[PDB]
């Protein structure tokens, strides 16, 4: 035999195929698997990898965030070049906290109705990945973006709330119930707010 102690611990868990039932998602996966295999661009490979992820791992993005990052990229651009196309593998939602935006071209899997209205009324354009593959088949002059995951209630609940240094929320339906011994100094003790490392 061969001494291979603990070699199964080096294998990694990765997804090869989609669990989605959407035929249009399947068509997009077919196109971008072809492109990622037959082209050298890194854009196509990243896009193909992201199309296979689960819904929870494709977080939605905000129109205001798109505008802010595009402006920060634009202030250092030669002003003789066109602005890049914003590309998000996910959903784009509208933001009522920001009224005035510039005109941009955004490619996405799905748009909110109000977000599509805002982009078009600002003079911009909404795009599908099938049009993007015709316009920029290697991903030249693009800005690939991701949405935010921290901030979710499920993430804010992770871990034990009773150990020192932790600020996770407990699972409780009655907000006034767990507010006593263990959380106040006047009771037996209080869970410490800070711990080094």
């Amino acid at each position: 035999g061969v001494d291979l102690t603990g070699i199964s611990k080096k294998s990694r868990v990765i997804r090869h195929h989609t669990y989605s039932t959407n035929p249009y998602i399947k068509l997009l996966i077919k196109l971008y698997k072809f492109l990622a295999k037959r082209t050298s661009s890194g854009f196509n490979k990243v896009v193909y990898q992201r199309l296979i992820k689960s819904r929870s791992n494709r977080a939605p993005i905000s129109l205001s965030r798109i505008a802010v990052v595009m402006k920060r990229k634009a202030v250092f651009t030669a002003k003789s070049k066109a602005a890049p196309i914003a590309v998000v593998v996910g959903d784009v939602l509208d933001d009522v906290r920001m009224a005035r935006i510039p005109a941009m071209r955004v490619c996405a899997l799905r748009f909110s109705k109000s977000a599509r209205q805002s982009i078009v009324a600002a003079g911009g354009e909404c795009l599908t990945f099938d049009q993007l593959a015709m316009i920029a088949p290697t991903g030249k002059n693009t800005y690939l973006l991701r949405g935010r995951k921290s901030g979710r209630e499920s993430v804010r609940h992770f871990g034990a709330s009773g150990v020192p240094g932790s600020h996770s929320k407990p699972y409780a339906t009655n907000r006034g119930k767990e507010t006593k011994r263990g959380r106040r100094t006047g009771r037996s003790y209080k869970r410490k707010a800070f711990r080094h490392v």
Binding site: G6, K9, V75, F76, F194, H196, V197
Partner: protein, 66 residues
Amino acid sequence: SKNHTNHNQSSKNHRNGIKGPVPLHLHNSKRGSWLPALVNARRVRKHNQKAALKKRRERIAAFAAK
């Protein structure tokens, strides 16, 4: 009835290895340090942030010029 031994414990501890310590440059908080030096360092950092904002504005203006 009350048995004690350490017989299999090192073998258990080495399956997922003894992990090394976190590098010195991460989680380098100053909370609990000697107070006067901390108070001075905070003022220096505030001035440094102001300087960083001014430098970015100057760079943007220079690029716009040329």
